[PDB]
Design an enzyme around this catalytic site. Structure first.
Site, PDB file in Angstrom:
ATOM      1  N   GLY A 211       0.907  -1.174  -0.113  1.00 39.23           N
ATOM      2  CA  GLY A 211       0.006   0.014  -0.208  1.00 39.23           C
ATOM      3  C   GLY A 211       0.897   1.003  -0.118  1.00 39.23           C
TER       4      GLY A 211
ATOM      5  N   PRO B  15       2.725   4.608   1.228  1.00 42.09           N
ATOM      6  CG  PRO B  15       4.671   5.840   0.892  1.00 42.09           C
ATOM      7  CD  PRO B  15       3.349   5.524   0.298  1.00 42.09           C
ATOM      8  N   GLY B  16       2.583   5.324   5.089  1.00 44.63           N
ATOM      9  CA  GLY B  16       1.957   5.632   6.142  1.00 44.63           C
ATOM     10  C   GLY B  16       0.568   5.083   6.430  1.00 44.63           C
TER      11      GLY B  16
ATOM     12  N   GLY C 156      -0.302   2.078   7.534  1.00 42.24           N
ATOM     13  CA  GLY C 156      -0.150   1.243   8.801  1.00 42.24           C
ATOM     14  C   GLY C 156       0.099  -0.473   8.522  1.00 42.24           C
ATOM     15  CE  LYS C 157       2.508   0.270   3.058  1.00 42.71           C
ATOM     16  NZ  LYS C 157       3.371   0.896   3.588  1.00 42.71           N
ATOM     17  CB  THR C 158       5.526  -1.073  10.136  1.00 42.85           C
ATOM     18  OG1 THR C 158       5.217   0.225  10.852  1.00 42.85           O
ATOM     19  CG2 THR C 158       6.149  -0.655   9.030  1.00 42.85           C
TER      20      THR C 158
ATOM     21  CG  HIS D 258     -10.234   6.450 -13.059  1.00 44.25           C
ATOM     22  ND1 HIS D 258      -9.253   6.514 -14.129  1.00 44.25           N
ATOM     23  CD2 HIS D 258     -10.166   5.516 -12.709  1.00 44.25           C
ATOM     24  CE1 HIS D 258      -8.557   5.376 -14.378  1.00 44.25           C
ATOM     25  NE2 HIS D 258      -9.006   4.567 -13.379  1.00 44.25           N
ATOM     26  CD  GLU D 259     -11.913   4.069  -8.653  1.00 45.49           C
ATOM     27  OE1 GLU D 259     -12.557   3.041  -7.885  1.00 45.49           O
ATOM     28  OE2 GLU D 259     -11.117   3.940  -9.292  1.00 45.49           O
TER      29      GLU D 259
ATOM     30  CG  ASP E 136      -6.988   1.234 -13.710  1.00 41.11           C
ATOM     31  OD1 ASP E 136      -7.725   0.387 -13.185  1.00 41.11           O
ATOM     32  OD2 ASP E 136      -6.649   2.314 -13.107  1.00 41.11           O
TER      33      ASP E 136
HETATM   34  N1  LIG Z   1      -4.898   2.452  10.353  1.00 42.71           N
HETATM   35  C1  LIG Z   1      -4.314   3.182  11.076  1.00 42.71           C
HETATM   36  N2  LIG Z   1      -5.032   3.072  12.287  1.00 42.71           N
HETATM   37  C2  LIG Z   1      -4.311   3.983  13.309  1.00 42.71           C
HETATM   38  N3  LIG Z   1      -3.084   4.394  13.283  1.00 42.71           N
HETATM   39  C3  LIG Z   1      -2.482   4.451  12.027  1.00 42.71           C
HETATM   40  C4  LIG Z   1      -2.957   3.510  10.886  1.00 42.71           C
HETATM   41  N4  LIG Z   1      -2.286   3.759   9.703  1.00 42.71           N
HETATM   42  C5  LIG Z   1      -1.222   4.533  10.168  1.00 42.71           C
HETATM   43  N5  LIG Z   1      -1.336   4.894  11.595  1.00 42.71           N
HETATM   44  C6  LIG Z   1      -0.155   5.503  12.236  1.00 42.71           C
HETATM   45  O1  LIG Z   1       0.692   5.974  11.260  1.00 42.71           O
HETATM   46  C7  LIG Z   1       2.040   5.788  11.485  1.00 42.71           C
HETATM   47  C8  LIG Z   1       2.771   5.044  10.508  1.00 42.71           C
HETATM   48  O2  LIG Z   1       2.213   3.830  10.092  1.00 42.71           O
HETATM   49  P1  LIG Z   1       3.337   2.975   9.682  1.00 42.71           P
HETATM   50  O3  LIG Z   1       2.548   1.347   9.816  1.00 42.71           O
HETATM   51  O4  LIG Z   1       4.628   2.868  10.097  1.00 42.71           O
HETATM   52  O5  LIG Z   1       3.451   3.049   8.116  1.00 42.71           O
HETATM   53  P2  LIG Z   1       3.684   2.079   6.690  1.00 42.71           P
HETATM   54  O6  LIG Z   1       2.323   1.700   6.314  1.00 42.71           O
HETATM   55  O7  LIG Z   1       4.291   2.768   5.628  1.00 42.71           O
HETATM   56  O8  LIG Z   1       4.613   0.842   7.030  1.00 42.71           O
HETATM   57  C9  LIG Z   1       2.055   5.169  12.920  1.00 42.71           C
HETATM   58  O9  LIG Z   1       2.506   5.633  14.027  1.00 42.71           O
HETATM   59  C10 LIG Z   1       0.640   4.735  13.082  1.00 42.71           C
HETATM   60  O10 LIG Z   1       0.317   4.630  14.532  1.00 42.71           O
HETATM   61 ZN   LIG Z   2      -8.706   2.905 -12.541  1.00 42.35          ZN
END
Ligand SMILES: Nc1ncnc2c1ncn2[C@@H]1O[C@H](COP(=O)(O)OP(=O)(O)O)[C@@H](O)[C@H]1O
Ligand SMILES: [Zn+2]
Ligand SMILES: Nc1ncnc2c1ncn2[C@@H]1O[C@H](COP(=O)(O)OP(=O)(O)O)[C@@H](O)[C@H]1O
Ligand SMILES: Nc1ncnc2c1ncn2[C@@H]1O[C@H](COP(=O)(O)OP(=O)(O)O)[C@@H](O)[C@H]1O
Ligand SMILES: Nc1ncnc2c1ncn2[C@@H]1O[C@H](COP(=O)(O)OP(=O)(O)O)[C@@H](O)[C@H]1O
Ligand SMILES: Nc1ncnc2c1ncn2[C@@H]1O[C@H](COP(=O)(O)OP(=O)(O)O)[C@@H](O)[C@H]1O
Ligand SMILES: [Zn+2]
Ligand SMILES: [Zn+2]
Ligand SMILES: [Zn+2]
Lengths: 420, 151, 412, 425, 412
Positions: free
Chosen positions: E50, E52-53, E55-57, E249-250, E313
């Site tokens: 997905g 960046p940011g 919430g993958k980690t 688009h959607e 697409d």
């Molecule tokens: N779905 C979510 N719910 C709550 N906090 C989120 C969510 N997505 C991101 N965050 C917050 O944003 C920050 C970045 O998330 P992170 O997992 O590190 O990034 P990435 O998706 O690039 O791996 C974290 O401190 C997290 O607490």
């Molecule tokens: Zn599309």
């Protein structure tokens, strides 16, 4: 752990070895050296330190080594390449040092290393220790190391370097005569009936090794024993045979024989190319004319395949011949400037595609020219060739002299190019 | 070996810094945080842990850092990235741990790392130790790390 | 591998010119501080190239032996990322055993991905050590044509010595050396054996005497007779027809040299295989000389008689022609552009190949015309070369003098 | 890793024989090192790095040691090979430490033998660290770095740019007089016989370096000693001679015409960088961006690069053009290729930049590059053709003096009534 | 890096569908022997991809936390030949701390020479461990399009989960989670803030509340008001004009799906970004759907209004068209030949490119005609999407039903 075997003077000799007389002749100096090393030493003669025996599993590599030791009346020290798999530290390297130590103590003797490929593909620690131990002993010691492998292609080149296993002998699968002689040897302890025809059994086993044949007679003996018989009849031998259904098909054999005869015929007719030898179904400055002739010989196998079987009967067997012929044609054009069209320019192996096209065209010209020549030659001598193939199918191996004699019968005088 | 400098409340301020008013404006939150970290902490605010200052040699990176500390009336703990060149074992990684230890003892304060490029290009042993020490301290500590680089 | 002297120049037969070249290496290894306080800088790397068995490892071992210095042996094939570490370790070991000699056999295996990274590590290790260390690296190769140019650059293996196959004299001297440990009969004539082995290397001769010894032993004899030596011989020798082809080729090169407009001294014709600026004419002439061998082959034997022997001369001639066109802008069609090569249009590549073909064919036609002109005195030179195996440049000129042709004074 | 600090006499200019022109050049370095404050108060600005290049044993370390000696200043010796490692960034630390040591012993001289070993990745990090340490110290410090190389052709151009080793002095192999003067210097501590003729010895040693001659007299002394003699006779000198290359006069003429070619382009350029000392140095010895260049500036840089070859053709014909123009041609083409494919300085190609490109565009690029080079080559040739007579004069002076100043070139042209552009130094 | 739980599903806002998917991973890590005695085999590798940011980690850390299992973190850029050793060591460490979780951020850096050898070492380490070990590897990437196909092959990272950008609901829930540790005023409306932040990730929202807190602190306040939040907002948000383009688009993709001849169920239209056999018609239809977004962009805005949003697409459509031609012999012109690619003549490459262009243009013209036909009910759908941000497939069909157009029943 570990285990090194010592048979001070073995009981197997050359009488227990069948059908590898050429090999038997090669190793005769090793026997003569082991019998009396100082006879050699007092002249300045230095026999091989290491001798590599390579072939398919069961062709008699350990047997030949044991027979060498037996004929010389010298101890046979057996060890396996897999027994140099260290259990902590570099204990693998210590075992090598110890083996040679043991050998020097029992001199004049023979070291035998089965599966040398296991130790010669920490890995380079035992391998190097073997290499240094090989360079460590001299002709004065009166010892010889014979190693055996089924996979010589995976062997470390360092092992075959001068001073080490610089002598290599290929032990082949037995031909009809070979097979019969092996059967005779292994039939000696067996109670065979009068009706058993070992000559038939040999003909009926193309592709089997000496081991397969030894097992075939052993299986037939077990069958006759279980049946409650004192003798072994053809019934038991045929039953024991059926456990063979990776053999040579008779149709497949015919294709091999035609291909092999094809090459020999090219060789015995090629204008100035050199020396033809033993035709078998069983596995420096050169001028432009010499190379055209070498291509002619390489295409011979395939040319015979087409002349005899048609364009649909040409086989995958010509794979390396075709590669080699094209490689040679490519070298003539792009390296040795032997093409008038390309000229005396050399491109060693950046090039415009026009030159690459011009090169490929000329290479195609040479190969097709020679292929047409080879085909015409096979077409011309098709009748005496059919005769050679028929002999080659029943004998599996024929001498160059035998080939020339068959042609002599058809009133055709070939070139005196047999190896002497 | 090694050498870490501590100037408990410096005398250089923004009056000693000229013509980077936009930069002066950016760093003003760092000054306000160092002055009173609990004002920030009692709201849930989390200022930066590390601030990278980059530019040509002599543009006033150490000066700006010293002025930040001075304006906030907070100790300035200076150290050089080249001083983390280990003399046997992993003594480089120990020095990093010790610097942050010293800083936490003098809080609210400022850590200054000149030539951060020397430690952040065994190499990944000191580098990683810096990275873990950065992740080790919180806003509760009331400390900020300012690193400077030309490359 | 780490060995000690035990082999000197007495075990090396002939190659006195080579022995003379390497004498500075032996004097440096004996006491490097004499050379260090001097101010002079010996080579860091020395490349030994020639056919297999000519005595490259032997010469290196003799250098170490004569100097009474350790000999640290290694091979190019003995070098995934662990290849670069082994190089670093070898030089580390060497510096610890100084003054000593590093020997790298098959340098072509490491000096032609892991195959290109160990190469650089060798290059940096070469640039890493100095004259102060008192160490020297000697590399050996059978395929110097496939060597990476980076290896031969200044500071690294910038000294190259070609070790040739022994001539009749050379063969006899080798036979004498290897006959020392053998019980030979009075009837054995090593002078004859030398004459009977053209094309063999020192190794082949050593094996020939070894094989003769083993035969005499097998036969049950207390001496080695000519019988055994002839038997060992039959068990790699240049055919008289082959000899004729080599002699015509060699004469071809010499004739071009003694007729080429400017420079390069001609020397000893035998049936055995930069700080300077050159102008366009000089290079056209160098190509002319290189094509001489083949030109003679065609003039004398026809298009079907041209041989594989011209392989290097053709490569060299073409390599020189491409440099003239694509590097030195010596082509009017291409112009003064220099292309050093995956950003160049196929049209320019075509234009370059065309010009290279033009130059080579021009010179090949010239060379052929020259051979055609002096075919009769050349036949005379070839007859002398066939009989004597080796002739002096002076001898060649004197044979032409007999046919009333005064050649250029370019010998020694 | 170590470094060797020399304390001051022993080696002065009296131990240096026959390079009086070089001795004259370096005299400002000796004066500055004596009192760095007095020379900046006077106005003289000294070099940071001085590159000494020549064959081994030609007295490069000797000249550097004599400079330090004459000035009575510490000599800090180091080798380039001591700053290599692969394992850890300790190479770059050693450089920083050397300059630290130097600043502590000021006024003093840094000497870097084999600068080519560090000047050609862990070695790159060290090279840059040297470059930054060179830019780190000032005239206020009282330090000068002298580097010596046998391989200046393989030196990184970054090392020679302004602020770094921007002064280069070529020390040549001694001619007969040179050899004789060296022999005289090294004969002072030797008991030579009346029969020894050093003038003959000079003629009998063509191609030897000062080092070789020093050793020849040392070996002759050891041979006379081992023979049991108080004097050294010609016998021992001839014996010492035996115990142990050239440049052609036609080749020299070609080099001189090529070198003069570049200088004429530079002094006519229309807009370029400074031109200096024209010399006959052999192929083996002899030797950008960061700032902004216009299309005319680059056309001019190409013009200068082709100058050497242009002179070769004008003077010798198409059959006389030489292999010496190899790097000039490469550099000129590289620059032309950048103008077309990177800086969109071609109308035909347009303002497109190629960093996966059709062969048609590659063709169009190659065509334009060929257009630029041939244009400039024709220009350069026309310039040489125009000033062929004063150039012949310059070459004749260059052949007899082997090295002529930019000023001398301009004053030769002045004789032919031609006023050149004010460049030089 | 080696961490311990301290983060659960309560710190993860929304993504309940994703939370449901990964629940088997949490149940397996809790007691692997229950799953081992079972006979079932969990995934070895799980790919999280997905923006960046998003919430993958965080999700990975929450999986480890919910299971009360160690979390061993590492990044793809942290991997000359020493790269392959680090991989071997990571898995060694993991097996020692079992049951635990391996986390690889930026898997694209290692999974796209040293860059291609560490990749294989990861692949072999993935094939090296079993379910018996009781360990699971979770990888995260922002660029899955540049990932090596070998990585996604069975046995290694064969499970992939796409984590999307939060919708208005999702944004509010995240804001609630990150507002817990903040002193917010009564006047702050997090529902409004969600509405005011379309396009932001969970990280952007976390930073927005953090920035608002720092402002309120700087200002000298004991609470965070809407003033601070609006100020922090101004300091990445989708423009209303941009929103219109995304919505068109959607809607374009959905209309194609609800009209395409055979299969694939259509689902939830939002202004936010194999074991099966397919016939030629199915793939032509899949291309038709993929081009739908762009087709709508051109029909509604013209050739100058077509946008960068169609990037994936278009890639996917072309990738599918090339596979049809060069892999599945679905082209009459090319025939039933399959080319998998540096042994193929340029003439065949041309013929392939031509056919791929033919297919795409055919379908693009078809898609455009469909958008042109239903332009009026589409305008209606876009108005609903702009207002609601997200609409159900059923809602779309019902809007078309109003315009007297009965679409295909393909929702859920
Ligand atoms: N779905 C979510 N719910 C709550 N906090 C989120 C969510 N997505 C991101 N965050 C917050 O944003 C920050 C970045 O998330 P992170 O997992 O590190 O990034 P990435 O998706 O690039 O791996 C974290 O401190 C997290 O607490
Ligand atoms: Zn599309
Ligand atoms: N040429 C042969 N003559 C006689 N017996 C043979 C021959 N080849 C193999 N055998 C028999 O086959 C068996 C296996 O032989 P062996 O040497 O162990 O095979 P390998 O080549 O794998 O080492 C032995 O019992 C041996 O007598
Ligand atoms: N913007 C500036 N205003 C005032 N003095 C400055 C400024 N920039 C540099 N200086 C002066 O230059 C000197 C060097 O500053 P410094 O911070 O050490 O440079 P760097 O950016 O390399 O760290 C100091 O004495 C400082 O007062
Ligand atoms: N010039 C020579 N004089 C004496 N013996 C020689 C000579 N050349 C080769 N030999 C012998 O031949 C053998 C092979 O020589 P070697 O140096 O190992 O081969 P290579 O040239 O491939 O490195 C040695 O045992 C050496 O004694
Ligand atoms: N010009 C010269 N005058 C006097 N002696 C010389 C001269 N050139 C070389 N020598 C002597 O030769 C030796 C080697 O000189 P050195 O400085 O090491 O040369 P380089 O640095 O060029 O390798 C020294 O002892 C030096 O005195
Ligand atoms: Zn064949
Ligand atoms: Zn030749
Ligand atoms: Zn030039």
């Amino acid at each position: 752990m570990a285990k090194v075997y010592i048979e001070e003077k073995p009981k197997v000799t050359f009488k227990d070895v069948a059908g590898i007389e050429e090999v038997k002749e090669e190793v005769k100096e090793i026997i003569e050296y082991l019998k009396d090393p100082v006879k050699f030493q007092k002249l300045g003669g230095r026999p091989p330190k290491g001798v590599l025996l390579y072939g398919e599993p069961g062709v008699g590599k350990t047997l030949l080594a044991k027979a060498i030791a037996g004929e010389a009346h010298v101890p046979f020290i057996s060890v396996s390449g897999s027994d140099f798999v260290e259990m902590f530290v570099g204990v693998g390297a210590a075992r090598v040092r110890d083996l040679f130590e043991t050998a020097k103590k029992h001199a004049p003797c023979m070291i035998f290393i089965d599966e040398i490929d296991a130790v010669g593909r920490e890995r380079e620690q035992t391998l190097n220790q073997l290499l240094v131990e090989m360079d460590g002993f001299d002709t004065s010691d009166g010892i010889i190391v014979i190693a055996a492998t089924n996979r010589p292609d995976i062997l470390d080149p360092a092992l075959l370097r001068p001073g080490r296993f610089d002598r290599q002998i290929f032990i082949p699968k037995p031909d009809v005569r070979g097979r019969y002689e092996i059967l005779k040897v292994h039939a000696r302890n067996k109670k065979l009936a009068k009706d058993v025809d070992l000559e038939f059994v040999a003909r009926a086993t193309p592709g089997l090794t000496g081991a397969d044949l030894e097992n075939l007679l052993n299986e037939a003996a077990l069958l006759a024993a279980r049946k409650g018989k004192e003798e072994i009849t053809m019934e038991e031998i045929e039953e024991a045979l059926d456990r063979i259904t990776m053999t040579i098909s008779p149709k497949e054999k015919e294709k091999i024989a035609i291909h092999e005869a094809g090459h020999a015929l090219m060789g015995l007719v090629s204008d100035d190319d050199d020396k033809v030898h033993k035709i078998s179904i069983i596995p420096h400055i050169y001028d432009k004319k010499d190379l055209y002739n070498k291509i002619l010989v390489l295409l011979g196998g395939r040319a015979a395949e087409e002349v005899f079987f048609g364009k649909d009967g040409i086989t995958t067997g010509a794979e390396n011949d075709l590669q080699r012929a094209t490689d040679l044609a490519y070298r003539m054009v792009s390296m040795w400037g032997m093409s008038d069209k390309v000229g005396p320019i050399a491109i060693r192996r950046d090039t415009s595609p026009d030159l690459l096209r011009e090169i490929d065209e000329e290479v195609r010209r040479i190969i097709t020219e020679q292929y047409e020549k080879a085909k015409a030659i096979v077409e011309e001598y098709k009748e005496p060739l059919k005769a050679v193939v028929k002999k080659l199918l029943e004998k599996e191996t024929i001498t160059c002299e035998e080939f020339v004699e068959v042609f002599k019968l058809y009133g055709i005088e070939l070139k005196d190019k047999c190896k002497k | 070996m090694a050498k870490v400098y501590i100037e408990e409340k410096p005398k250089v301020t923004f009056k000693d810094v000229a013509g980077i008013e936009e930069v002066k404006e950016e760093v003003k939150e760092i000054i306000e945080y160092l002055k009173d970290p609990v004002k920030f902490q009692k709201l849930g605010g989390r200022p930066p842990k590390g601030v990278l200052l980059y530019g040509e040699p002599g543009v006033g990176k150490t000066l700006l850092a010293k002025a930040i500390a001075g304006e906030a009336h907070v100790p300035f703990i200076s150290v050089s990235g080249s001083d983390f060149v280990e003399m046997f074992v992993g003594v480089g990684a120990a020095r990093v741990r010790d610097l942050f230890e010293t800083a936490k003892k003098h809080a609210p304060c400022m850590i200054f790392i000149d030539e951060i490029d020397a430690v952040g290009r065994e190499r990944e042993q000191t580098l990683n130790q810096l990275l873990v020490e950065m992740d080790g301290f919180d806003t509760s500590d009331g400390i900020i790390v300012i690193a400077a680089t030309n490359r």
